[PDB]
């Protein structure tokens, strides 16, 4: 069922999940997308420490169970997040230190895992235990001050609480191999394995942005941890800008590492993101698929069996043999595009950007002046509107992000001068394109 | 002066105004920008028919006077918007017809203009009286059904009501000279001038978007009406996507016409816009100046001593004599830019886009990883964030939109390999750039 992220991921034995927020489950648009696209669920906040143990010794699973029930009800496995962490600790825990904190950490793990015993596929036992100062050492928190062995203790406690769950160490900024933090985490997991400390996986949050950009060496990082005898998972994926290339690259990295169990993006729609300003997810506020959604789906499905048009190129219609053409090489905003004999001309060289735009002349964009059938497809100053974003379907169709409509050669026309419009996708030859 | 739009416009005897919303006058972030940048004000809603005459014969000028007083007290003239219009009429007027409506229209004009007699620079006496059906004729409204001469009567009444006020006919989609609507309005004004009908100006709302895009012939339209002996004014300008080039083009069109009194943009910040989703104004919601802002200011100040960049070229540091270079022509996100001997290489060719990006390799963007002094300037996948948008000042500095900080050669370095960072603008030579 290569039409959804989860089903496509399953074609390689992997899963594709998202972070679910219980307060959004009543939003039909939200749940429709969530239930359809993912087969793995992580509670975005409902299973955290402050949410599960409001007061010392007083557990509360109402919020967590809403997420859990929704997941199982809709056929999804669940990643528990998270048992031990320095952040978002309830007030009573923040006031703790030393052995009292250590026992509280232990009691919390037992309580929460006990409640979900045998129902959780993966547990992020310890979250973000390493520093960002740049040296790759432990993060100084009340937990770390109880003793360096707190992490090991948390894992030994978790294994005993629920031996059916895969135990993961989860963290961010550990994707680039050259980072000290990545290496500090590697050394710890290696040590655990060497000493029989029970740890089954390492979760790479994968929160990519210009401050901590994705880097191709991520594949070696995954390979390096996998070699230690642990599974690896991309746990909180989101990319600032939602670059199609970066999203596909990360997906391909996981598909290249047999031990990479799957990918979870941190949210459903950009508006649901903890960093919405970065529009880093696969669906926009409207609930529509972004250019990145298609890049990911295509990567999961193996991608095109030929070299993608790097540095721009022509877009030739299959049912007409003619290329996408801007009339008379005009640069006037509002000029509807047409079909025309292909040739070496700037007014026929289109470049698909990572943001999903189809640019010509360098700063002009394939633009749709509306969202319904017949809408004129023209060129307009590039600005990033969804009516300027396109998805390149593997079936050769090019769909408008905002409209969900396909580029369509009017009346099935095939001769030069044939104009281009938007139209309900029909899988027709006049809606199919082969690039060059 | 020339550091603000209003002052810059004043140098040529023109004005740069905005639409003021009375509800936001209590917002210091709003007023700080408004009082500083504009010298002309149009009440966004407080002077309309329904807002000034809630019931026939009962006038209410409280809200209108609030905006008017704020304008005058802060050094701004005022454009009255609007006296006769088919839209937003109070309920009672919407039910009138024939002679009774005609009389109500006249009484309204007399009541409002009498109240502001001698205090309004320009009055939009009649608003949007032409159809968008492509016929170039009058739109069918209760006002039109009272007789084709209603517009003429509205103007004659106005002149008598307040002879010191410049009387304008205001409409939208009358910018592209080839459009039938434009011709329709042109013929009318021409007729009025030949018959002595008291009309002094024509206001072009100038709402541009991919549906009704800006066209260079807008200057022809402006020149054509000016030739009729009437002044012209851009009254409600906003450009979908806030293209720098288009904003500058519209500005130059007005400067090219001796009769163009000035330019008013329909709002202060994008978040105050009736079309916020199109981010069509000059200021971001956070109050920061956008790429277009500087493009408009530069145009008002006479542009540059030399022809602007036609997309694609080097950026040479003034103090170093070296160019902005991406090390080893790397395309890796996170790569910090440096200074390096200038030469013909794609890793030194930057294209400034209308959106304010500085692109290299076609799809990589000059990126600021943060907003504080010392922030690293690098290349990152283009996505449109404000940390990827820049303003090209006429003084040679390049300012980050989001940060408000200048491109800066670290330590005033001049040698190859000197890194680029963000830093408080100092007018230093290591912060000024030019063309090779
Ligand atoms: O002038 C006829 C046609 O000639 C072709 O070379 C151009 O690419 C088309 O845009 C143009 O319409
Ligand atoms: O006839 C309405 C539309 O039907 C679609 O199937 C065709 O692909 C379009 O070109 C046509 O305009
Ligand atoms: O190899 C040293 C330098 O050579 C120049 O040609 C490149 O443009 C620089 O980016 C590079 O750092
Ligand atoms: O004081 C440190 C900073 O001073 C500024 O004046 C310089 O332009 C910067 O390059 C420098 O890093």
Coordinates of N, CA, C and O in Angstrom, one line a residue, chain A residues 269-405:
Chain A
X269 N 0.8 18.4 11.3 CA 0.8 19.6 10.4 C 1.8 20.6 11.0 O 2.0 20.6 12.2
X270 N 2.3 21.5 10.2 CA 3.2 22.5 10.6 C 2.6 23.3 11.8 O 3.3 23.7 12.7
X271 N 1.3 23.5 11.8 CA 0.6 24.3 12.8 C 0.6 23.6 14.2 O 0.4 24.2 15.2
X272 N 0.8 22.2 14.1 CA 0.9 21.4 15.3 C 2.3 21.3 15.9 O 2.5 20.9 17.0
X273 N 3.3 21.8 15.1 CA 4.7 21.7 15.6 C 5.1 22.6 16.7 O 4.6 23.7 16.9
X274 N 6.0 22.1 17.5 CA 6.5 22.8 18.7 C 7.4 24.0 18.2 O 7.8 24.9 18.9
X275 N 7.6 23.9 16.8 CA 8.4 25.0 16.2 C 7.7 25.3 14.8 O 8.3 25.1 13.8
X276 N 6.4 25.7 14.9 CA 5.6 26.0 13.7 C 6.2 27.1 12.9 O 6.1 27.0 11.6
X277 N 6.9 28.0 13.5 CA 7.5 29.1 12.7 C 8.5 28.6 11.7 O 8.8 29.2 10.7
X278 N 9.0 27.3 12.0 CA 10.0 26.7 11.0 C 9.3 25.9 10.0 O 10.0 25.3 9.2
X279 N 8.0 25.7 10.0 CA 7.2 24.9 9.0 C 8.1 23.7 8.7 O 8.5 23.6 7.5
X280 N 8.4 22.9 9.7 CA 9.3 21.7 9.5 C 8.7 20.3 9.4 O 9.4 19.4 9.4
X281 N 7.4 20.3 9.2 CA 6.7 18.9 9.0 C 6.3 18.6 7.6 O 6.7 19.3 6.7
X282 N 5.5 17.5 7.4 CA 5.1 17.1 6.1 C 3.7 17.5 5.6 O 3.4 17.3 4.5
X283 N 3.0 18.1 6.5 CA 1.6 18.6 6.2 C 1.5 20.1 6.6 O 2.1 20.4 7.7
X284 N 0.9 20.9 5.9 CA 0.8 22.3 6.3 C -0.5 22.5 7.1 O -1.3 21.6 7.3
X285 N -0.7 23.7 7.6 CA -1.9 24.1 8.3 C -3.2 23.6 7.7 O -4.1 23.2 8.5
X286 N -3.3 23.6 6.4 CA -4.5 23.2 5.7 C -4.7 21.7 5.8 O -5.8 21.2 5.5
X287 N -3.6 21.0 6.1 CA -3.7 19.6 6.2 C -3.3 19.0 4.9 O -3.3 17.8 4.7
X288 N -2.8 19.8 4.0 CA -2.4 19.3 2.7 C -0.9 18.8 2.7 O -0.1 19.3 3.4
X289 N -0.7 17.9 1.8 CA 0.6 17.3 1.6 C 1.6 18.3 1.1 O 1.3 19.0 0.1
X290 N 2.8 18.5 1.7 CA 3.8 19.4 1.3 C 4.7 18.7 0.3 O 4.6 17.5 0.1
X291 N 5.5 19.5 -0.4 CA 6.5 18.9 -1.4 C 7.3 17.8 -0.7 O 7.7 16.8 -1.3
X292 N 7.6 18.1 0.6 CA 8.5 17.1 1.3 C 7.8 15.8 1.6 O 8.4 14.8 1.7
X293 N 6.4 15.8 1.7 CA 5.7 14.6 1.9 C 5.9 13.6 0.7 O 6.2 12.4 1.0
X294 N 5.9 14.2 -0.5 CA 6.1 13.3 -1.7 C 7.5 12.9 -1.8 O 7.8 11.7 -2.3
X295 N 8.5 13.7 -1.4 CA 9.9 13.3 -1.5 C 10.1 12.2 -0.6 O 10.8 11.2 -0.9
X296 N 9.5 12.2 0.6 CA 9.7 11.1 1.6 C 9.0 9.9 1.1 O 9.6 8.8 1.1
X297 N 7.7 10.0 0.7 CA 7.0 8.8 0.2 C 7.7 8.2 -1.0 O 7.8 7.0 -1.1
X298 N 8.3 9.0 -1.9 CA 9.0 8.5 -3.1 C 10.3 7.8 -2.6 O 10.7 6.7 -3.2
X299 N 11.0 8.3 -1.6 CA 12.2 7.7 -1.1 C 11.9 6.4 -0.5 O 12.6 5.4 -0.7
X300 N 10.8 6.3 0.3 CA 10.4 5.1 0.9 C 10.1 4.0 -0.1 O 10.3 2.8 0.1
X301 N 9.5 4.5 -1.2 CA 9.2 3.6 -2.3 C 10.3 3.2 -3.2 O 10.1 2.6 -4.3
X302 N 11.5 3.6 -2.9 CA 12.7 3.4 -3.7 C 13.1 4.5 -4.7 O 14.2 4.4 -5.3
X303 N 12.2 5.5 -4.8 CA 12.5 6.6 -5.7 C 12.6 6.3 -7.2 O 12.4 5.1 -7.5
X304 N 12.8 7.3 -8.0 CA 12.9 7.1 -9.4 C 14.1 6.3 -9.8 O 15.1 6.4 -9.2
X305 N 13.9 5.4 -10.9 CA 15.0 4.6 -11.3 C 16.0 5.3 -12.2 O 16.7 4.7 -13.0
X306 N 16.0 6.6 -12.2 CA 16.8 7.5 -13.0 C 17.3 8.7 -12.3 O 16.6 9.2 -11.4
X307 N 18.4 9.3 -12.7 CA 19.0 10.5 -12.2 C 18.1 11.8 -12.2 O 17.7 12.2 -13.3
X308 N 17.7 12.3 -11.1 CA 16.8 13.5 -11.0 C 17.4 14.7 -11.7 O 18.6 14.9 -11.7
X309 N 16.6 15.5 -12.3 CA 17.0 16.7 -13.0 C 17.7 17.7 -12.1 O 17.1 18.6 -11.6
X310 N 19.0 17.6 -12.0 CA 19.8 18.4 -11.2 C 20.1 19.7 -11.9 O 20.5 19.7 -13.1
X311 N 20.1 20.9 -11.2 CA 20.3 22.1 -11.8 C 19.3 22.5 -12.9 O 19.6 23.1 -13.9
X312 N 18.0 22.2 -12.6 CA 17.0 22.6 -13.6 C 16.9 21.6 -14.7 O 17.6 20.6 -14.8
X313 N 16.0 21.9 -15.6 CA 15.8 21.0 -16.8 C 14.4 21.2 -17.4 O 13.6 22.0 -16.9
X314 N 14.2 20.5 -18.5 CA 12.9 20.6 -19.2 C 11.8 19.7 -18.6 O 12.2 18.7 -17.9
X315 N 10.6 20.0 -18.8 CA 9.4 19.2 -18.3 C 8.6 18.9 -19.5 O 7.8 19.7 -20.0
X316 N 8.8 17.7 -20.1 CA 8.1 17.3 -21.3 C 6.8 16.5 -21.0 O 6.9 15.5 -20.2
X317 N 5.7 16.9 -21.6 CA 4.5 16.2 -21.4 C 4.5 14.9 -22.2 O 4.9 14.9 -23.4
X318 N 4.2 13.8 -21.6 CA 4.2 12.5 -22.2 C 3.1 12.3 -23.3 O 3.5 11.8 -24.4
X319 N 1.9 12.8 -23.1 CA 0.9 12.7 -24.1 C 1.0 13.7 -25.2 O 0.1 13.6 -26.1
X320 N 2.0 14.5 -25.3 CA 2.2 15.5 -26.4 C 3.6 15.6 -26.9 O 3.8 16.1 -28.0
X321 N 4.5 15.1 -26.1 CA 5.9 15.2 -26.4 C 6.5 16.6 -26.4 O 7.6 16.8 -26.8
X322 N 5.7 17.6 -26.0 CA 6.1 19.0 -25.9 C 6.5 19.4 -24.5 O 6.1 18.8 -23.5
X323 N 7.3 20.4 -24.4 CA 7.8 20.9 -23.1 C 7.1 22.1 -22.5 O 6.5 22.9 -23.2
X324 N 7.1 22.2 -21.2 CA 6.5 23.3 -20.5 C 7.2 24.6 -21.0 O 8.4 24.7 -20.8
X325 N 6.4 25.5 -21.5 CA 7.0 26.7 -22.1 C 6.4 28.1 -21.7 O 5.2 28.2 -21.7
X326 N 7.2 29.0 -21.3 CA 6.7 30.4 -21.0 C 6.7 31.2 -22.3 O 7.8 31.5 -22.9
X327 N 5.5 31.5 -22.9 CA 5.3 32.2 -24.1 C 6.3 33.3 -24.4 O 6.4 34.3 -23.6
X328 N 7.0 33.2 -25.5 CA 8.0 34.2 -25.9 C 9.1 34.6 -24.9 O 9.6 35.7 -25.0
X329 N 9.4 33.6 -24.0 CA 10.4 33.9 -23.0 C 10.1 35.1 -22.2 O 11.0 35.8 -21.7
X330 N 8.8 35.5 -22.1 CA 8.4 36.6 -21.3 C 8.6 36.4 -19.8 O 8.6 35.3 -19.3
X331 N 8.8 37.5 -19.1 CA 9.1 37.4 -17.7 C 8.0 38.2 -16.9 O 8.0 38.4 -15.7
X332 N 6.9 38.6 -17.7 CA 5.8 39.3 -17.2 C 4.9 38.4 -16.2 O 4.4 37.4 -16.6
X333 N 4.7 38.9 -15.0 CA 3.9 38.2 -14.0 C 2.5 38.0 -14.6 O 1.9 39.0 -15.1
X334 N 2.0 36.8 -14.5 CA 0.6 36.6 -15.0 C 0.6 35.9 -16.4 O -0.4 35.6 -16.9
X335 N 1.8 35.7 -16.9 CA 1.9 35.0 -18.2 C 1.6 33.5 -18.1 O 2.4 32.8 -17.4
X336 N 0.5 33.0 -18.6 CA 0.1 31.6 -18.5 C 1.2 30.8 -19.3 O 1.6 31.2 -20.4
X337 N 1.5 29.6 -18.8 CA 2.5 28.8 -19.5 C 1.8 27.9 -20.5 O 0.6 27.8 -20.5
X338 N 2.6 27.4 -21.5 CA 2.0 26.6 -22.6 C 2.9 25.4 -22.9 O 3.9 25.2 -22.2
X339 N 2.5 24.7 -23.9 CA 3.2 23.5 -24.4 C 3.9 24.0 -25.7 O 3.3 24.8 -26.4
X340 N 5.1 23.5 -25.9 CA 5.8 24.0 -27.1 C 7.0 23.0 -27.4 O 7.5 22.4 -26.5
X341 N 7.3 23.0 -28.7 CA 8.4 22.1 -29.1 C 9.6 22.4 -28.2 O 10.0 23.5 -28.0
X342 N 10.2 21.3 -27.7 CA 11.3 21.4 -26.8 C 12.6 21.9 -27.5 O 12.9 21.5 -28.6
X343 N 13.3 22.7 -26.8 CA 14.6 23.2 -27.4 C 15.4 23.9 -26.3 O 14.9 24.3 -25.2
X344 N 16.7 24.2 -26.6 CA 17.5 24.9 -25.6 C 17.1 26.3 -25.5 O 17.5 27.2 -26.2
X345 N 16.3 26.6 -24.5 CA 15.8 27.9 -24.3 C 15.5 28.1 -22.8 O 15.0 27.2 -22.1
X346 N 15.9 29.3 -22.2 CA 15.8 29.5 -20.8 C 14.3 29.5 -20.4 O 14.0 29.1 -19.3
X347 N 13.4 29.8 -21.3 CA 12.0 29.8 -21.0 C 11.4 28.4 -21.0 O 10.2 28.2 -21.1
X348 N 12.3 27.4 -20.9 CA 11.9 26.0 -20.9 C 12.6 25.2 -19.8 O 12.4 24.0 -19.7
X349 N 13.6 25.9 -19.2 CA 14.4 25.3 -18.2 C 13.8 25.5 -16.8 O 14.0 26.6 -16.2
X350 N 13.2 24.5 -16.2 CA 12.6 24.6 -14.9 C 13.4 24.0 -13.8 O 14.0 22.9 -14.0
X351 N 13.5 24.6 -12.6 CA 14.3 24.1 -11.5 C 13.4 23.8 -10.3 O 12.7 24.8 -9.9
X352 N 13.4 22.6 -9.8 CA 12.6 22.3 -8.7 C 13.4 22.5 -7.4 O 14.4 21.8 -7.2
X353 N 13.0 23.4 -6.6 CA 13.7 23.8 -5.4 C 13.3 22.8 -4.2 O 12.3 22.2 -4.3
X354 N 14.2 22.8 -3.2 CA 13.9 21.9 -2.0 C 12.6 22.3 -1.4 O 12.0 21.5 -0.7
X355 N 12.2 23.6 -1.6 CA 10.9 24.1 -1.0 C 9.7 23.7 -1.8 O 8.6 24.0 -1.5
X356 N 9.9 23.1 -3.0 CA 8.8 22.7 -3.8 C 8.4 23.6 -4.9 O 7.4 23.4 -5.5
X357 N 9.2 24.6 -5.2 CA 8.9 25.6 -6.3 C 9.4 25.1 -7.6 O 10.4 24.3 -7.6
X358 N 8.8 25.6 -8.7 CA 9.3 25.2 -10.0 C 9.6 26.6 -10.6 O 8.8 27.3 -11.1
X359 N 10.9 27.0 -10.5 CA 11.4 28.2 -11.0 C 11.9 28.3 -12.4 O 12.5 27.3 -12.9
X360 N 11.8 29.4 -13.0 CA 12.2 29.7 -14.4 C 12.9 31.1 -14.3 O 12.4 31.9 -13.5
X361 N 13.9 31.3 -15.1 CA 14.6 32.6 -15.1 C 15.4 32.8 -13.8 O 16.1 33.8 -13.7
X362 N 15.2 32.0 -12.9 CA 15.9 32.1 -11.6 C 15.0 32.6 -10.5 O 15.2 32.2 -9.3
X363 N 14.1 33.6 -10.7 CA 13.3 34.1 -9.7 C 11.8 34.2 -10.1 O 11.0 35.0 -9.5
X364 N 11.4 33.5 -11.1 CA 10.0 33.4 -11.5 C 9.5 32.0 -11.1 O 10.2 31.1 -11.2
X365 N 8.2 32.0 -10.6 CA 7.7 30.7 -10.2 C 6.4 30.2 -10.8 O 5.5 31.0 -11.1
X366 N 6.2 28.9 -11.1 CA 5.0 28.3 -11.6 C 4.0 28.7 -10.5 O 4.2 28.3 -9.4
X367 N 3.0 29.4 -10.9 CA 2.0 29.9 -10.0 C 0.6 29.6 -10.4 O 0.2 29.7 -11.6
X368 N -0.3 29.3 -9.5 CA -1.7 29.0 -9.7 C -2.5 30.2 -9.2 O -2.4 30.5 -8.0
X369 N -3.4 30.8 -10.0 CA -4.2 31.9 -9.6 C -5.6 31.3 -9.2 O -6.6 31.7 -9.8
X370 N -5.6 30.5 -8.2 CA -6.9 29.9 -7.8 C -6.7 28.4 -7.3 O -5.6 27.9 -7.4
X371 N -7.7 27.8 -6.9 CA -7.6 26.4 -6.5 C -8.6 25.4 -7.1 O -8.5 24.2 -6.9
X372 N -9.5 25.9 -8.0 CA -10.4 25.0 -8.7 C -10.0 24.6 -10.1 O -9.0 25.1 -10.6
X373 N -10.8 23.7 -10.7 CA -10.5 23.2 -12.0 C -10.5 24.4 -13.0 O -11.3 25.3 -12.9
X374 N -9.6 24.3 -14.0 CA -9.5 25.3 -15.0 C -8.5 26.5 -14.6 O -8.1 27.3 -15.5
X375 N -8.2 26.6 -13.3 CA -7.4 27.6 -12.8 C -6.2 27.8 -13.8 O -5.5 26.8 -14.1
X376 N -5.9 29.0 -14.1 CA -4.7 29.3 -15.0 C -3.4 29.1 -14.3 O -3.2 29.5 -13.1
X377 N -2.5 28.4 -15.0 CA -1.2 28.1 -14.4 C -0.3 29.1 -15.1 O -0.1 29.1 -16.3
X378 N 0.4 30.0 -14.4 CA 1.2 31.0 -14.9 C 2.5 31.2 -14.2 O 2.9 30.3 -13.4
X379 N 3.2 32.3 -14.5 CA 4.5 32.6 -13.8 C 4.3 33.8 -13.0 O 3.5 34.7 -13.4
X380 N 4.9 33.9 -11.8 CA 4.7 35.0 -10.9 C 6.0 35.1 -10.0 O 6.7 34.2 -9.8
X381 N 6.2 36.3 -9.5 CA 7.4 36.5 -8.6 C 7.3 35.5 -7.6 O 6.3 35.2 -6.9
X382 N 8.4 34.8 -7.3 CA 8.5 33.8 -6.3 C 8.4 34.3 -4.9 O 9.1 35.3 -4.6
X383 N 7.5 33.8 -4.0 CA 7.4 34.3 -2.7 C 7.1 33.1 -1.7 O 7.0 33.4 -0.5
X384 N 6.9 31.9 -2.2 CA 6.7 30.8 -1.3 C 5.2 30.4 -1.0 O 5.0 29.5 -0.1
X385 N 4.3 31.0 -1.6 CA 2.9 30.7 -1.3 C 2.6 29.2 -1.7 O 3.3 28.7 -2.5
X386 N 1.7 28.5 -1.0 CA 1.4 27.1 -1.3 C 0.9 27.0 -2.8 O 1.0 25.9 -3.3
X387 N 0.4 28.1 -3.3 CA 0.0 28.1 -4.7 C 1.2 28.1 -5.6 O 1.0 28.2 -6.9
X388 N 2.4 28.1 -5.1 CA 3.6 28.1 -5.8 C 4.4 26.9 -5.5 O 5.6 26.7 -5.9
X389 N 3.9 26.0 -4.7 CA 4.5 24.8 -4.3 C 3.9 23.6 -5.0 O 2.7 23.5 -5.2
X390 N 4.8 22.7 -5.5 CA 4.3 21.5 -6.2 C 4.9 20.2 -5.7 O 6.0 20.2 -5.2
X391 N 4.1 19.1 -5.9 CA 4.6 17.8 -5.5 C 4.8 17.0 -6.8 O 4.0 16.9 -7.7
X392 N 6.0 16.4 -6.9 CA 6.3 15.6 -8.1 C 6.0 14.1 -7.9 O 6.8 13.4 -7.3
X393 N 4.8 13.7 -8.2 CA 4.4 12.3 -8.0 C 5.2 11.3 -8.8 O 5.6 11.6 -10.0
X394 N 5.4 10.1 -8.3 CA 6.2 9.1 -9.0 C 5.5 8.7 -10.3 O 6.2 8.2 -11.2
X395 N 4.2 8.8 -10.4 CA 3.4 8.5 -11.6 C 3.5 9.5 -12.7 O 2.8 9.5 -13.6
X396 N 4.5 10.5 -12.5 CA 4.6 11.5 -13.5 C 3.7 12.7 -13.4 O 3.9 13.7 -14.2
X397 N 2.8 12.7 -12.5 CA 1.9 13.8 -12.3 C 2.5 14.9 -11.4 O 3.3 14.5 -10.5
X398 N 2.2 16.1 -11.6 CA 2.7 17.2 -10.8 C 1.5 17.9 -10.2 O 0.6 18.4 -10.9
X399 N 1.4 17.8 -8.9 CA 0.3 18.3 -8.1 C 0.5 19.6 -7.3 O 1.6 19.7 -6.7
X400 N -0.4 20.5 -7.4 CA -0.3 21.8 -6.7 C -0.6 21.5 -5.2 O -1.6 20.9 -4.8
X401 N 0.3 22.0 -4.4 CA 0.2 21.8 -2.9 C -1.1 22.4 -2.4 O -1.8 21.7 -1.7
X402 N -1.3 23.6 -2.6 CA -2.5 24.3 -2.1 C -3.8 23.8 -2.7 O -4.8 23.6 -2.0
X403 N -3.8 23.5 -4.0 CA -5.0 23.0 -4.6 C -5.3 21.5 -4.6 O -6.4 21.0 -4.7
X404 N -4.2 20.7 -4.5 CA -4.3 19.3 -4.6 C -4.7 18.9 -6.0 O -5.1 17.8 -6.3
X405 N -4.5 19.8 -6.9 CA -4.9 19.6 -8.3 C -3.6 19.4 -9.2 O -2.5 19.9 -8.9

